Design an enzyme around this catalytic site. Structure first.
Site, mmCIF file in Angstrom:
data_model
loop_
_atom_site.group_PDB
_atom_site.id
_atom_site.type_symbol
_atom_site.label_atom_id
_atom_site.label_comp_id
_atom_site.label_asym_id
_atom_site.label_seq_id
_atom_site.Cartn_x
_atom_site.Cartn_y
_atom_site.Cartn_z
ATOM 1 N N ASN C 104 29.851 -49.163 76.721
ATOM 2 C CA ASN C 104 30.748 -48.016 76.625
ATOM 3 C C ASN C 104 32.207 -48.412 76.434
ATOM 4 O OD1 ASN C 104 28.537 -46.238 77.107
ATOM 5 N ND2 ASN C 104 28.764 -46.565 79.317
ATOM 6 N N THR C 154 16.451 -70.282 49.599
ATOM 7 C CA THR C 154 16.046 -68.885 49.644
ATOM 8 C C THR C 154 15.412 -68.510 48.311
ATOM 9 O OG1 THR C 154 18.392 -68.459 49.229
ATOM 10 C CG2 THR C 154 17.542 -67.946 51.421
ATOM 11 N N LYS C 156 14.491 -66.394 45.355
ATOM 12 C CA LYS C 156 15.107 -65.271 44.671
ATOM 13 C C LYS C 156 14.396 -65.057 43.346
ATOM 14 C CE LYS C 156 19.795 -65.520 45.487
ATOM 15 N NZ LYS C 156 21.019 -65.904 44.734
ATOM 16 N N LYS C 158 15.177 -61.279 45.385
ATOM 17 C CA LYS C 158 14.684 -60.644 46.598
ATOM 18 C C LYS C 158 13.582 -59.636 46.309
ATOM 19 C CE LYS C 158 16.893 -58.816 49.538
ATOM 20 N NZ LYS C 158 17.705 -58.088 50.556
ATOM 21 N N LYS C 182 12.764 -70.443 52.243
ATOM 22 C CA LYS C 182 13.133 -69.360 53.142
ATOM 23 C C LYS C 182 12.729 -68.011 52.568
ATOM 24 C CE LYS C 182 16.992 -67.222 55.586
ATOM 25 N NZ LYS C 182 17.093 -66.057 54.664
ATOM 26 N N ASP C 184 13.358 -64.094 52.408
ATOM 27 C CA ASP C 184 14.576 -63.326 52.560
ATOM 28 C C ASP C 184 14.471 -62.378 53.753
ATOM 29 O OD1 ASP C 184 17.197 -62.785 50.881
ATOM 30 O OD2 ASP C 184 16.491 -60.897 51.762
ATOM 31 N N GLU C 185 15.637 -61.962 54.257
ATOM 32 C CA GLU C 185 15.687 -61.017 55.369
ATOM 33 C C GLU C 185 15.121 -59.651 54.999
ATOM 34 O OE1 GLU C 185 19.891 -62.049 53.910
ATOM 35 O OE2 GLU C 185 17.852 -62.853 53.903
ATOM 36 N N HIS C 275 17.688 -65.490 61.312
ATOM 37 C CA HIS C 275 18.657 -64.995 60.347
ATOM 38 C C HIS C 275 19.586 -63.997 61.027
ATOM 39 C CE1 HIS C 275 20.391 -62.915 56.871
ATOM 40 N NE2 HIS C 275 20.045 -63.970 56.156
ATOM 41 N N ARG C 276 20.856 -64.008 60.620
ATOM 42 C CA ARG C 276 21.904 -63.237 61.276
ATOM 43 C C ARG C 276 22.301 -61.993 60.487
ATOM 44 N NH1 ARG C 276 27.758 -66.208 60.481
ATOM 45 N NH2 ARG C 276 27.593 -66.534 58.221
ATOM 46 N N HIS C 308 21.800 -69.239 61.249
ATOM 47 C CA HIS C 308 22.850 -69.236 60.243
ATOM 48 C C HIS C 308 24.207 -69.197 60.927
ATOM 49 C CE1 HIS C 308 20.417 -68.157 56.475
ATOM 50 N NE2 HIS C 308 19.538 -68.343 57.443
ATOM 51 N N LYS C 315 35.638 -71.343 53.778
ATOM 52 C CA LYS C 315 36.934 -70.921 54.281
ATOM 53 C C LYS C 315 37.984 -71.971 53.942
ATOM 54 C CE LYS C 315 36.088 -68.123 57.703
ATOM 55 N NZ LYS C 315 36.266 -66.644 57.723
ATOM 56 N N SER C 360 24.450 -71.584 54.395
ATOM 57 C CA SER C 360 23.866 -70.933 53.233
ATOM 58 C C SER C 360 24.879 -69.988 52.603
ATOM 59 C CB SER C 360 22.595 -70.160 53.604
ATOM 60 O OG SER C 360 22.066 -69.483 52.479
#
Lengths: 108, 444, 444, 108, 140, 146
Positions: C104, C154, C156, C158, C182, C184-185, C275-276, C308, C315, C360
């Site tokens: 809350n 991954t 692909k 997807k 991998k 996929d999510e 996976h995040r 992940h 960055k 990734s």
């Protein structure tokens, strides 16, 4: 013009008709005898009327042809147990069931 | 990137899943480019065509942006409308739809913020999910409660009460007049109070209150657990002891766990109260997140009989439309598009039963006429402070709340403007209720 | 409100749960007041003392703010440090701790934004949770892989691949040289590709690649399901067919479901890839949300072998400290406090095994020396585009990635500055690897 | 100065308010009719008030617009069953529920 | 234990034999061959118990003496319309049907031709049953 | 019987279950009457309104005949098109749909013959049933036959 249905405890076969008198009971006994069934008399307390097994009044009248005798035995059962409900049954040995079953006295 | 995943001419099918994204893009980037970016990253996630792409029907298996609209009052944001074929998702998986929609698009670096405003669930996909285990009308039939909103209370403090002391708060709260009491979102099984003792003492208190009052009583027993096995065990124990309703935290506990618990509740005839804990980390930011109306759609798809929606009175008069819109989304069978109320898509629910609206947080006897006028009979009003803070006790506070509720309901039925005449109605009711009178005196 | 729930003098116990909140308050409100507000709403939720409050030990069962610090570079925000007794939470329930912390407080109206920056899990509470099913070292022992980071990919697109076509992508990817592929999510069970056919064809491809290569192979088979029953069924089928690793979406699937699946994986000897998905709706906003370092702590408490964490190279050089800090949080046994890296509390993990770091997203052969230098051997590098976009095919791309990885690892072992000499090392490796050479030519 | 709460058996909606007179009952019936609901009359023994299924008094008044007729039917129900609780309901066919339900006489 | 077999009264008098034949097939232990009733083979059932005959569809209080005479005691009579269409409600319709059933059974037991005297028997029963009387008035 | 269960103007919804019946009626009976008869007996089964009927939404929970067409080459038969709301059936029950459609209408005495020619399953109801366990392409992939 519309009136409500009055709820009351009901007692299976012939319970929705006015109580049977001697003539009607004799006619039912005659029908049961003519069908080859064995008349029988049972009684129970009113609160216990629902039970599958009632107190057995003497023995089923095997081979009995006296409607008057069966009625007299019903009245004797009533006299012996004034406060008990009284039922008349007719055993069907071939089907292992009852060809007729109704309450003679409704308890009190 | 442009011509491939956004089609202005595309007319969306009645079975298509439609999503509306408020895109706050980086200055200088193209609106259509950003729309196609959300569409692609939410459907396929890439633009570079690889050799495995040519093995599939690329024209079909992709999300397409078909309309871009300006955001009224915000020149830095625009609305992107994206259509998704029903084939892209597992049938009856709010988890899969939610993942496909929000897995990676919110991490897009070319936009400053991304908000999922509305999602259109077609009737074809709606018919697959179980939905609410019982629904509003079936719950009303089971509880034998009609013609008034339901009353609830959160047992406080959140910490310290033993099983028996928590039960002796619940018992007075229920015997005072509340239809329900509520386990807190924190209370599942703590060292100071274990869950089995909670369930046993709560059931004892509920049975005692029901026997002493003559009204059906309940407690949202929290079955949120570290493991689905533990959650199912707690729900089964609640059913075994006879608890008519349980509570789950559908966000922190998880959508998969909530769907499983809702299916179990529908199977076993147990009502399900849903708490919306954590919803603020998601739906509060105006430029980044997923809207509580989308969360409400997801929850009613997953399954639940009650759901917290806010007190409505807690916002200003000019900021109530979105709350009313998601209230209609939760409760009504068909909600037409309404930009003023934040309903971006026509949402057809078919035969799926509605979910009771729960209003909780800082509301007492004075807000009550407004609460009744806003929510109607198909709602649950929760009084934690407004019941426990009563100077005469929990039972007196519950009696005050119940008397106020009945008076307001009768006033509404008589045709009076209950919000305009709230003070007069409450005073007239208090002329026969000392507990209610002292309640207004306390909370004036 | 002030004197009751914030104690400047309070010294936090070694068993206390500590939380750091970045409060961006409404202008004019008191810093200590806001700190006590977060402490109260996260522990008890109210200030008005009711009669049930006096039945408990109010001095004990409450969260207290013990320190307020300025935020460097942000005069509009301050840091609030709050201590929570270990008694306030269910033992071994990341769900309960997470709910108690974030139920809350993020909806507080007196603050413009609230961010949960760090949470201190005491060793006493750490010892109760199961933690990662296997851990880094046990997974390395099981897979017979040492001295180099693991390679993943991954598959692909997807969307669109049938079971056999997805398997015939996985087979070439694995036989090319990647240790893992991998799911996929998004892929759990779709109409175009059902989960059982996925598991069967994936296991066939993995077995064929393992037989043809001589190295242990795996595929993170997604078991995220609408219901925990379905998830457990899919995991059991994966174990039955012999899949060594499965994958779960621990945020969208739910923390309860993830904890249950992690316990099942520890019981059944099946590796768990995490996976995040959705993490961006939570951790992206700098002024409102819960940090990915807190999410990483929660995930490693719940259980998981992979996670992940970001590519780090994605960055700028001046924005890598927080990522490195949560990498250390995920992998290391004891992480000292480091304000530069965003570690606000000393975090003692005891004997709980570490979790493999997964990098990734948009990374290829050129980023690889930097990836090796930053992550070390205890990491998994995922190449979706960098493997599937290879002009000669998935096998050639995987071979290029593996050759580059081995060359970079040997260069690091020889004592060379792999980041400074990355181009020379990769060219020298490409003198013996045409696939690698054409890979750099493609991705230059 | 605090007053003890007196516990007594309660009867759901409008049970915490003083018993409704003819004017209040007529207002409730008018509200139910204006909402498009069908008024209905039920009655049970006081000890049997909890039952989900009450004895149905006649039939629900479909399309009825006479609040006075509904009140007269309520009084006729009371006269026919003086010792029974009397409840007034309003059927909502669209929602398959009751839009209003309260007890007119609380039994004795 | 139960089986729908038709109302028998729903067919003409000359088309009832096949229905009666399959009624005997359902209920009786041994059914001799009967080409008129459509029984082509002698069917010996041994000790297998019979199955109750269910008559349903467009039947009300007036068909009832014929239903009793045709089916006997070992049958189930279903009254959907004949009970729900009662002007006084489901309970009143059920009471009317039960009173008619008991009166017809007693009349059969007394040796009367219940089909020939059905109207008289039902009227005599209705002299003690207003629900039954209004039932015949509705369905006449 | 006529105005109640057959609506010429009704436009069938995309979620409605549509059924086409070839009605060979008894000579002299009305085509629209027979169409409404199939619609009613396949949905509600009665015309006499009872007191329990008024407790429900009669306008919704009923099957309606919306189109009657001539049968090419057969002047003694006509085609009746009936629309059924998706709410009338258990989700994912071919048994329930089949029972609701063919339970009693074929025993109708006012028609000489009744044939169910076609039934429209809307995508909404289709998505609920499991359907073929594997399908043609998955079976081909499993058996390695192309």
């Amino acid at each position: 013009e519309m009136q409500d249905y009055k709820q009351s405890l009901k007692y299976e076969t012939f319970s929705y008709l006015p109580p049977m008198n001697a003539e009607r009971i004799r006619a039912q006994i005659k029908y049961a005898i003519a069908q080859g069934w064995s008349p029988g008399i049972e009684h129970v307390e009113v609160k216990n009327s629902m039970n599958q097994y009632w107190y057995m009044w003497k023995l089923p009248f095997f081979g009995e042809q006296n409607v008057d005798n069966v009625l007299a035995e019903i009245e004797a059962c009533r006299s012996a147990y004034p406060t008990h409900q009284v039922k008349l049954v007719a055993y069907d040995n071939y089907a292992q069931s009852l060809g007729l079953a109704f309450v003679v006295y409704r308890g009190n | 990137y442009r011509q491939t995943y956004w089609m202005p001419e595309y007319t969306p099918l009645d079975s298509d899943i439609l999503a509306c994204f408020k895109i706050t893009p980086q200055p200088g980037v193209d609106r259509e480019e950003a729309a196609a970016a959300v569409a692609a990253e939410s459907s396929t996630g890439t633009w570079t065509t690889v050799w495995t792409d040519l093995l599939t029907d690329m024209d079909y298996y992709k999300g397409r942006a078909y309309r871009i609209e300006d955001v009224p009052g915000d020149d830095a944001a625009f609305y992107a409308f994206i259509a998704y074929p029903i084939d892209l998702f597992e049938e009856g998986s709010v988890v899969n739809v939610f993942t496909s929609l929000v897995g990676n698009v919110f991490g897009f670096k070319a936009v400053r913020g991304l908000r999922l405003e509305d999602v259109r669930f077609p009737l074809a996909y709606v018919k697959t999910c179980g939905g609410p285990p019982h629904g509003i009308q079936v719950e009303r039939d089971k509880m034998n409660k009609y013609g008034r909103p339901l009353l609830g209370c959160t047992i406080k403090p959140k910490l310290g009460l033993s099983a028996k002391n928590y039960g002796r708060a619940v018992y007075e709260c229920l015997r005072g007049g509340l239809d329900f009491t509520k386990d807190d979102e924190n209370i599942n099984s703590q060292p100071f109070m274990r869950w089995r003792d909670r369930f046993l003492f709560v059931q004892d208190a509920t049975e005692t209150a029901e026997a002493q009052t003559g009204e059906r009583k309940g407690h949202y027993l929290n079955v949120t657990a570290p493991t689905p096995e533990e959650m199912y065990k707690r729900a089964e124990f609640a059913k075994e002891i006879g608890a008519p309703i349980i509570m789950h935290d559908y966000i922190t506990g998880g959508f998969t766990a909530n769907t499983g618990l809702a299916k179990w509740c529908q199977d076993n005839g147990v009502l399900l109260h849903i708490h919306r804990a954590m919803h603020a980390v998601i739906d509060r930011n105006p430029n980044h997140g997923i809207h509580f109306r989308v969360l409400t759609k997801i929850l009613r798809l997953s399954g639940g009989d009650h759901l917290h929606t806010g007190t409505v009175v807690g916002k200003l008069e000019g900021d109530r439309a979105s709350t009313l819109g998601w209230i209609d989304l939760l409760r009504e069978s068909f909600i037409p598009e309404d930009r003023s109320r934040g309903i971006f898509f026509d949402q057809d629910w078919g035969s799926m039963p509605g979910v009771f609206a729960v209003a909780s947080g800082g509301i007492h006897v004075w807000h009550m006429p407004a609460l009744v006028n806003i929510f109607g009979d198909d709602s649950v009003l929760q009084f934690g402070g407004g019941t426990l803070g009563h100077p005469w006790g929990n039972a007196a506070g519950a009696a005050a709340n119940r008397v106020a509720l009945e008076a307001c309901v009768e006033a509404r039925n008589q045709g009076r403007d209950i919000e305009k005449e709230g003070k007069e109605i409450l005073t007239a009711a208090a002329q026969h209720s000392p507990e209610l009178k002292i309640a207004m005196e306390t909370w004036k």
